[PDB]
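Re-run with default settings, no changes from the original entry. Doing this only to confirm the output is reproducible before filing.
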Amino acid sequence: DDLVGFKLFLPEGPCDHTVVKLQPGDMAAITTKVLRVNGEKILEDFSKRQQPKFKKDPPLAAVTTAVQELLRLAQAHPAGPPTLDPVNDLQLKDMSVVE
């Protein structure tokens, strides 16, 4: 169950958020889904809210929408949606990678 695709994590608690500075290697996959969310407004929400006194601001729509969409994406695929295949989605033809 862990070796077929990418095991879709289902959070055991309430659907919170974090905004992390990820490396390319910390990312398991580049998903096929296209969620037209605005990164700028999410920065204007995470960086704005992360004042310890203002961490309790009412949520902005871009962050709540992104978090809800991510959780729905986790539920909406039984074991993980197909990734943008290196060969069959990025239009490559190297035999070694196909094999």
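Residues 61-75 form the longest helix (15 residues). Residues 45 and 59 are 8 Å apart (CA to CA).
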